[PDB]
Design a binder for these strands. Structure first.
Ligand SMILES: Nc1ncnc2c1ncn2[C@@H]1O[C@H](COP(=O)(O)OP(=O)(O)OP(=O)(O)O)[C@@H](O)[C@H]1O
Ligand SMILES: [Mg+2]
Ligand SMILES: [Zn+2]
Lengths: 60, 615
DNA sequence: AGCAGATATCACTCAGCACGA
DNA sequence: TCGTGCTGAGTGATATCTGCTTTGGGTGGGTGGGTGGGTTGAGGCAAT
């Protein structure tokens, strides 16, 4: 099948597209909180709610 | 193109270079270890020491297998030997010992795919500089090593800009001078990578000139064969770039002949040597003197006349406490203890400026010296400016003085515009530019040292102090401390002054032997330590300062009832008193401000003006 | 050296006819 | 009404030669302009 690759690299454009779509569809700020070593500041409503889905809805 | 028979055989010299790189020792070979480091991406610059080459030649001669003089060949024509050494290094590059992510690099993938395409075509390439990940430089032959082996070191002998003539072109020479200009670092293209929209192949181009003509048409075998006309498009991702910097080196004052103007020589910096030269530093730049041919119509119109520049290869950079410090400020002058102490207080400039209410008391203990001609005002200015790290000397520059003392000479002669500029510097501690061309505002918390002469040239006792001073009274009031210096004739003082000056003229050294001046380095580092320090004051000292303030205010009002007083004491005098006390506490290295410091500041204030006025 | 205009010599398309099928 | 040449001059096209001009600086000028650059120093003038 035609397979699209960024010139000079071996990264598949399809893989990047699907990864970004998955990240946008399912992501919560609690992951950022745990990454930043601020896990004990996690609440139960905002950090457990989808972030970029809400951003897209507000943008629309 | 008639030929000549020159006594140089590049094959033998290449063999010599390879043997030197492989075998030379000074553990394993030094340059083999360097290449091993380069392979593992640990080093990006290789420097060839001509001393090592000379030692290797001496050893070979001692062993009986006399070889060609490589040092002289390198010195006489260094441009070719750079490429020769690069080729020798490439032919003997050790395999990497530390695994690296090859697939990350774009060039690796592109070359691997080119290899795959070539294999496919065969079943039915790139410039060496493209893959090079290091830079080569030549270190001049040290004079000590040359004298040890009975040889003359032309490369390492310093030369002035004038001594660099046309017969030195193409050689490795050293230049001594002061850098006057350095440009910004910019990317210089060496190899250009193109792409074919139709073919799918990559093309490369080598640039060794000021200008180049880009490719337009594909030259690939496939394209040619198939007759497909494919356009070439530049690709900056796969291209090779090297940091470039252009600098100007000017002659030193002692190198110019009598009745001649200094000259300048261009310098080109490539590779990792970038950022090694800054304006104002005296340097010993070693490089290859080369011409810069023109191109196109300019080439034809110019004629035989050629520009020149230097390819940088190596850069060598040239280099009771209160009383002691005061006396060591300017040993050459006759003892003026109070003025020296005031200069110390200005230099340290200790202060706590953290009001946070919208403004903050000025953190500079400004000093102004006014006196008749004859006092060593210029000497104090020059000395105190030299000691200061940010001291700037100007004649009636502020930006350079930011967060530092400003050394202004001929203060009275200054134009009114500069008077307003310094007024803005004091009251607002800001530098503002309002121009069409540009609009930049730079903060300036800089202290000012001012030297001025009276209105009539010499102080007139009959006239009031304000009359003798041309500057506006507000500027005088804003000055934290004002020192009036006068020359009163006297047998004893004149005799001592004459003896001191005569001894200085004869023996070229300080006449005083009662005490030994403190080393300037110790004094400056002590000043820096004091500046780093932060003092603190209590409530009792605050009440003492308040009492001193009321006493001073009453005394100053009584004095100003007459015309002799310079001016009435004001809250500005207060703030100056606390500033001086904080500076003295910083000097003491004790956090708590003591009553002794306040008393010393008060006596300094009294002796700055009244001591000399009463005389 | 590079660029824009021009000359002239290089092929290729539709045109159509003779034989036989 | 398909296949295979032979004829053919027309309609291209693309591989191929013939003349500027330029940088910048007065070794192109001021009937090409000064808003396309140069350009710091001396000089005369009006408002001050
Ligand atoms: N106390 C002194 N001891 C020795 N030499 C001195 C002293 N005071 C002044 N001089 C000499 O005076 C000479 C001229 O004076 P200087 O330039 O130092 O200051 P100044 O008279 O305040 O200057 P200006 O004439 O520019 O107002 C200097 O060469 C300096 O050597
Ligand atoms: Mg002076
Ligand atoms: Zn191609």
């Amino acid at each position: 099948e035609p397979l699209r690759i960024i010139w000079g690299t071996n990264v598949s454009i399809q893989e990047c597209t699907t990864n970004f779509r998955n990240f946008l569809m399912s992501f919560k700020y609690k992951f950022r909180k745990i990454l930043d070593e601020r896990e004990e500041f996690i609440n139960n409503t905002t950090d457990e709610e989808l972030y970029y889905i809400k951003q897209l809805n507000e943008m629309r | 193109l008639p030929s000549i028979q020159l006594p140089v055989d590049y094959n033998n010299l290449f063999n010599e270079i390879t043997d030197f790189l492989v075998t030379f020792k000074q553990k394993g070979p030094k340059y083999m270890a360097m290449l091993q480091k380069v392979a593992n991406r640990e080093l990006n610059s290789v420097i060839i020491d001509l001393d090592d080459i000379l030692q290797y030649q001496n050893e070979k001669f001692l062993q009986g297998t006399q070889a060609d003089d490589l040092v002289s060949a390198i010195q006489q024509n260094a441009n070719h030997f750079t490429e020769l050494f690069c080729r020798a290094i490439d032919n003997n590059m050790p395999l990497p010992t530390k695994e690296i992510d090859y697939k990350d690099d774009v060039l690796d993938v592109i070359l691997n795919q080119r290899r795959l395409r070539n294999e496919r075509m065969l079943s039915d390439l790139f410039p060496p500089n493209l893959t090079r990940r290091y830079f080569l430089y030549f270190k001049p032959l040290s004079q000590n090593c040359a004298r040890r082996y009975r040889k003359k070191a032309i490369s390492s002998k310093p030369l002035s800009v004038r001594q660099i003539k046309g017969d030195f072109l193409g050689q490795l020479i050293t230049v001594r001078g002061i850098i006057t200009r350095v440009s910004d670092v910019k990317p210089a293209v060496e190899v250009i990578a193109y792409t074919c929209d139709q073919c799918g192949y990559e093309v490369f181009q080598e640039v060794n000139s000021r200008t180049f003509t880009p490719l337009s048409e594909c030259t690939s075998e496939e394209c040619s064969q198939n007759q497909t006309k494919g356009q070439l498009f530049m690709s900056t991702r796969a291209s090779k770039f090297s940091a470039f910097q252009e600098c100007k080196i000017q002659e030193l004052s002692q190198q110019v002949p009598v009745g001649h103007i200094p000259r300048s020589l261009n310098i080109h910096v490539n590779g990792t040597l970038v950022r090694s030269l800054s304006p104002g530093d005296i340097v010993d730049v070693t490089g290859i003197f080369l011409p810069a041919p023109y191109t196109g119509f300019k080439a034809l119109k110019a004629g035989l006349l050629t520009e020149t520049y230097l390819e940088a290869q190596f850069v060598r950079q040239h280099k009771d406490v209160y009383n002691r410090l005061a006396k060591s400020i300017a040993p050459e002058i006759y003892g003026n203890l109070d003025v020296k102490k005031a200069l110390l207080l200005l230099l340290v400039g200790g202060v706590d400026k953290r009001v946070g209410d919208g403004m903050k008391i000025r953190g500079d203990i400004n000093v102004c010296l006014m006196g008749d001609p004859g006092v060593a005002k210029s000497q104090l200015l020059k000395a105190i400016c030299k000691i200061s790290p940010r001291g700037v000397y100007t004649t009636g520059a502020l930006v350079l003085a930011d967060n530092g003392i400003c050394c202004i000479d001929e203060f009275d002669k200054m134009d009114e515009s500069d008077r307003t500029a310094i007024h803005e510097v004091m009251e607002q501690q800001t530098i503002s530019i309002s121009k069409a061309g540009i609009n930049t505002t730079l903060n300036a918390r800089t202290s000012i040292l001012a030297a001025a002469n009276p209105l009539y040239g010499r102080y007139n006792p009959r006239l009031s102090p304000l009359d003798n001073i041309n500057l506006p009274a507000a500027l005088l009031s804003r000055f934290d401390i004002l020192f009036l210096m006068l020359d009163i004739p006297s047998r004893d003082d004149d005799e001592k002054l004459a003896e001191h000056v005569t001894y200085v003229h004869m023996h070229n050294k300080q006449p005083d032997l009662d005490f030994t001046p403190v080393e300037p380095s110790k004094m400056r580092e002590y000043i820096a330590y004091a500046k780093t320090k932060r003092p603190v004051m209590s409530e009792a000292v605050n009440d003492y300062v308040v009492q001193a303030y009321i006493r001073l205010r009453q005394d100053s009002k009584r004095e100003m009832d007459s015309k002799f007083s310079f001016g009435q004491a004001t809250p500005r005098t207060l703030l100056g008193i606390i500033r001086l006390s904080q500076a003295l506490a910083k000097l003491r290295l004790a956090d708590m401000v003591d009553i002794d410091d306040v008393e010393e500041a008060l006596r300094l204030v009294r002796v700055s003006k009244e001591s000399l006025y009463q005389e």
